[PDB]
Amino acid sequence: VIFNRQPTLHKMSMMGHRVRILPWSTFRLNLSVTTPYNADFDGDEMNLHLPQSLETRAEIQELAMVPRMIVTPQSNRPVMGIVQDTLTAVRKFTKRDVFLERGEVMNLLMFLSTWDGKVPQPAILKPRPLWTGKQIFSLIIPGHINCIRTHSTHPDDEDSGPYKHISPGDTKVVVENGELIMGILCKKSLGTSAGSLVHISYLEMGHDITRLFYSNIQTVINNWLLIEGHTIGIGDSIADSKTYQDIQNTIKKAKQDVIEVIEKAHNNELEPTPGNTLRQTFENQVNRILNDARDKTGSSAQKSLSEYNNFKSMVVSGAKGSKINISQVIAVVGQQNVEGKRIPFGFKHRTLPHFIKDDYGPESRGFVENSYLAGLTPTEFFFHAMGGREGLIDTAVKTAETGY
Amino acid sequence: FIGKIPIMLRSTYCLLNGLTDRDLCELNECPLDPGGYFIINGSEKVLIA
């Protein structure tokens, strides 16, 4: 049948599927096609059409069927790659420290599909049998699919460290003859990125075996996940006394420096930058200070995260959310702004009646000091809602215009 | 007699305005119902500011 959704933004939004009958009352979908439909399961409806002849059934099977909608011509990279929870579980699984006993390997082997039936020799024979994570993954990778590079997560170094002779810093993802040689897999390898592993399966071995490869990978990794687990709790949102003092102290340095710029402006000691007015210069300068403050403190928070942390594992895998979210949760929410600029003087020369007239200082006009964990003060709270509204309105307005 | 005007529920012109918790439970009306809205042909019709 062909199954689809509205709005049908592009050809990948409507594709052929085989029915598989189950109990209860909803359409079940293989989690990995969630992205080309852009669905969730937060409550989304989908519609199914059943063709009515052999000519149209042939035309769908041959043209529109999902293993054939994989690499999109929209931008010659895959439309779908490993998503969500499985993707974090694949990161966690390929790390070099993962080891499995004869029982766990046999259980995972049992869930695979094309498994030849020959248990590979464990990477550690003595003192006890142990299989490594990468190794079990190599049973999933088709006939001889072979990538390179695609290490490019936060890890390793921003290009010069690895040339310092290659000391197995473990990030680089090397595969050969369809066998994973080293390095953690992630959004950069498995994602819908042009250079990805899923791209090489399709391009190399043909569409069908790639289709079974998506099925095969998601299933094996999810079972391992079942013994491993994954979570998030306030434990992920907490750093230490030293990070937190340094965060406050760094905000204290930034705020005092703004007061210095205000004093320079009131003293009329300041001069305009070329091509701009004095307010624009003052505003350009305070904005440069509050962003730079924000990024320095965010980079501090990134530095403090322990490696065990669940929160850091979702961003680094490339499952959900970004580095900036960790900043806001741990260190500081940062500047609020409407139409680009800082919160306008909606009152006579003020933002809220709680402030004094003419208070360009960072708090009365926008910038929130606290983190989502510490909570926002009342004013901080309301200014945040102004910044959140821009995001709600823009979604509705943009949706209509692109539609047209 | 010139006409019939709708009464807003539980205002001083409703029958409900003076009664305690006991009379309202007796009359079959929930004491916790906020009132303030018209009843028109069996429909609750609320005006919008």
Binding site: H17, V19, L22, F27, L50, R211 | -
Partner: protein
């Protein structure tokens, strides 16, 4: 250019990892209500006769 169609269905969707990528699980009520028109051959005649 766009009209209502027959042989069509709609429900809420939920995830199923045990599912192949090009399969879709479908409720019994929709499977029994929806129909496909098969044509009878001299060999599958016996199976259709069963149905």
């Amino acid at each position: 250019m766009g009209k209502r169609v027959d042989f069509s269905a709609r429900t809420v969707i939920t995830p199923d990892p045990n599912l192949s990528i090009d399969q879709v699980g479908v409720p019994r009520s929709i499977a029994a209500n929806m129909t496909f028109a098969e044509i009878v051959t001299p060999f599958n005649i016996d199976r259709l006769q069963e149905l």
